[PDB]
């Protein structure tokens, strides 16, 4: 009976960088034309949400963050055709408008309506649906899932299987799809190849999953936190290396281990130095390196372009290269059919009210994904 | 007869950086096992030979440069099976040993036996076949074509059609193949696409030829020398732009002209700034940029990795990505079958004795390719 009415609910508001989230009452406006209001069920903590806190990823504050989630449609605005009240949905932090040059391209997925390249922290219409203490609060990536209710544009939501377990499939909204697609869609890992994966968090584990699914013969995990190695091996890594253990730079180590460079390398951390190291460790004539980590705002890397002239390919991608609204329902259907596993990514579960504890777990190195339940 | 004997002949020796070539008598040793001695017939002047003079491209001096050439086998060493005396041949500045990981890979062409990565300026066996005034002279890229006779390793020569016109097909030894392959093999330009080509010298014109052959709908030539535009249009450019004409950076101009970025861009100059500009002007989600120009020794570029994270692909290649010994004979057969033209690249034909005049034409902006005839 909330349709057409403002909803008062709890959200996690970030008022300032480098401070805890504030769990407090917000007002959530009803959906306008082509908007959908969603009752959240579960949301994951992705490192990119932490990047908002640390100022690594700049977006306007104050803000409701969160972008990896699943929920149930509470109401729809005028003209919505793709979801209905009561449908299970995943918000799409990369929209799929279906009309722009990228959406029409066979490969492209970074729809021109995204709010990632130059964040404004609004709905598509340039306004906000959120008020707190009487003040407007920004959106994040058109999703804002750290709230009991959010409002998203229709191009930023996908209907998923009615029988889906939302406390698992929320990871299809970011970390799993990003890493898995980086391997299977962006790099196009080949059977029998050697892969190196830098960073063994939720996204990097999902890259390993995808390299293993593509038939790689060797998958070398790289992390400075050796506590990450056991789970990386469980999901497919054949060996793991800690750069801190070596006197030589790890690109040299990896080149030696792979008898002249790897076929595919993945940067899944977000550091400029490891982006260049990961490029360098792929074979100089035919290697491919994929950047998935999010770099610190406005900072440039330095590299020798002879790394490319010999024949290397360097690319990056958002959301694993997947066209979001076409792919998310299919990934959920494949999960339901047991084509991949999400449980290896989930190390902790907490109620939404303990969001700050969830971020502490990420920052301490202890968690992969913590799932928050509303 | 000359077989088995030292040949005294004329060559252009580079004794020091930034000096004219010295045209004088050298001694050319007979070929050892698996080596081939070639009587040169024609050699082109490529900007990479000038980079040796300018110190842009470091290789041991003193040196006999030259790498884009065609000639006739004078004699073969023990064990040679792929050419015989009297055969027309093109020396291969990128070898094809057929045994290394790169040669065995379907895509790779930068054979591990190359002398480009870490130049030693010798034969494969670590010695030189050249002396001048009693001093040993270095080889260049396993070819050294600025000489009436040279000696190359068997993996660095290809037999070509006995009826081929050597004064034209010498360009298949570098400039034509490099540019054409950058388009058709490395970028894999698609029908209907928009391409931008930075640098309208012999290599860049060959990139335009490839883009046109691949069916590009728009091919935008970019050069600071407007005298290069007429020939670019003759070989397929649909429009040309001079960055000096605009108040805004050319990547902005090209993004606007292409309604949001080009499909394929090509850096065919060798400047760090234009490498980054070329990357930036390709469409951010699905654009591809290829580096063909040779960068100045030991210098790094600076770039924001968000250019890649959005979805761009950045790659480079040597020799157009062609496996050299397999491809050169087929390219010559294709030329003989009128599948592409070489005449548009040739602006000047001079006797070998005028090599310095040929370099002056290149440096002054007045030539595309000068062919030197022996
Ligand atoms: N491209 C996308 O769409 C995208 C990008 N991100 C970004 O991916 C990176 C990884 O995210 P994560 O897996 O959620 O993060 P962590 O759990 O923190 O794992 C990182 C991993 O790296 C190790 N590490 C740190 N420093 C080093 C060094 N020097 N060497 C080796 N390993 C190192 C840690 O120990 C840890 O285990 C992040 O940058 C993230 O921002 C994620 C998801 C999506 N995206 C885009 C927008 C929203 N989400
Ligand atoms: N990758 C290979 O295998 C390769 C590489 N090279 C390199 O390609 C570049 C172009 O060579 P070229 O066509 O022989 O050179 P030029 O005739 O001098 O044409 C350059 C073109 O650029 C224009 N220009 C200069 N500066 C600018 C700026 N700032 N903006 C725009 N245009 C600009 C000039 O006016 C001129 O028209 C070289 O770097 C070359 O080294 C060639 C061949 C092969 N290779 C590798 C090893 C041996 N050969
Ligand atoms: Zn779109
Ligand atoms: Zn994320
Ligand atoms: Zn080889
Ligand atoms: Zn050349």
Curated annotation (Swiss-Prot), chains A, B:
Keywords: Acetylation, Cytoplasm, Metal-binding, NAD, Oxidoreductase, Zinc. It catalyses: a primary alcohol + NAD(+) = an aldehyde + NADH + H(+); a secondary alcohol + NAD(+) = a ketone + NADH + H(+). The keyword Protein biosynthesis does not apply. Binds 2 Zn(2+) ions per subunit. Zn(2+) 1 binds at residues 46, 48, 67, 174. PROSITE patterns: ADH_ZINC. GO terms for molecular function: all-trans-retinol dehydrogenase (NAD+) activity; zinc ion binding. Its cofactor is Zn(2+). SUPFAM superfamilies: GroES-like, NAD(P)-binding Rossmann-fold domains. InterPro entries: ADH-like_C (IPR013149), ADH-like_N (IPR013154), ADH_Zn_CS (IPR002328), GroES-like_sf (IPR011032), NAD(P)-bd_dom_sf (IPR036291), PKS_ER (IPR020843). An alcohol binds at residues 48, 67. One of its GO terms (cellular component) is cytosol. Zn(2+) 2 binds at residues 97, 100, 103, 111. Pfam families: ADH_N (PF08240), ADH_zinc_N (PF00107). It is an enzyme of class 1 (oxidoreductase). Its EC number is 1.1.1.1. The modification N-acetylserine is found at residue 1. NAD(+) binds at residues 48, 199-204, 223, 228, 292-294, 319, 369. GO terms for biological process: retinoic acid metabolic process; retinol metabolic process. Signal peptide: none annotated. It is found in: Cytoplasm. Belongs to the zinc-containing alcohol dehydrogenase family. Class-I subfamily. Dimer of identical or non-identical chains of two types (E and S) coded by 2 separate genes at different loci. PANTHER family: ALCOHOL DEHYDROGENASE, ALCOHOL DEHYDROGENASE 1A. This is Alcohol dehydrogenase E chain.
């Amino acid at each position: 009976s909330t349709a057409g009415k403002v909803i008062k609910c709890k959200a996690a508001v970030l008022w300032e960088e480098k401070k805890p989230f504030s769990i407090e009452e917000v007002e959530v406006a009803p959906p306008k034309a082509h908007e959908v209001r969603i009752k959240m069920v579960a949301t994951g903590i992705c490192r990119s949400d932490d990047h908002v806190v640390s100022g690594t990823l700049v977006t306007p504050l104050p803000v409701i963050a969160g972008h990896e989630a699943a929920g149930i449609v509470e109401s729809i605005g005028e003209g919505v055709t793709t979801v209905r009240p009561g449908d299970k949905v995943i918000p799409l932090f990369t929209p799929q408008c279906g009309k722009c040059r990228v959406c029409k391209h066979p490969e492209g997925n970074f729809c021109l309506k995204n709010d990632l390249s130059m964040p404004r922290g609004t709905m598509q219409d340039g306004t906000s649906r959120f008020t707190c203490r009487g003040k407007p609060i920004h959106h994040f990536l058109g999703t804002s899932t750290f709230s009991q209710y959010t409002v998203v544009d229709e191009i930023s939501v996908a209907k998923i299987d009615a029988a889906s377990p939302l406390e698992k499939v929320c990871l299809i909204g970011c970390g799993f799809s990003t890493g898995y697609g980086s391997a299977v869609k962006v790099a196009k890992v080949t059977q029998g190849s050697t892969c190196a994966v830098f960073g063994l968090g939720g996204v990097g584990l999902s890259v390993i999953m995808g390299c293993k699914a593509a038939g790689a013969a060797r998958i070398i995990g790289v992390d400075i936190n050796k506590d990450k190695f056991a789970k990386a091996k469980e999901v497919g890594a054949t060996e793991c290396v800690n750069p801190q253990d070596y006197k030589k730079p790890i690109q040299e180590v990896l080149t030696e281990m792979s008898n002249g460079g790897v076929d595919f390398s993945f940067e899944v951390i977000g550091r400029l130095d490891t982006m260049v190291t990961a490029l360098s460790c792929c074979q100089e004539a035919y290697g491919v390196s994929v950047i998935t980590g999010v770099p610190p705002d406005s900072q440039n890397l330095s590299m020798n372009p002879m790394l490319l002239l010999s024949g290397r390919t360097w690319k990056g991608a958002i959301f694993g290269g997947f066209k979001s609204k076409d792919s998310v329902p299919k990934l959920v259907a494949d999960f339901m059919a047991k084509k991949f596993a999400l449980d290896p990514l989930i190390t902790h579960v907490l109620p939404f009210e303990k969001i700050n504890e969830g971020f502490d777990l990420l920052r301490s190195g202890e968690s992969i994904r913590t799932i928050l339940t509303f």
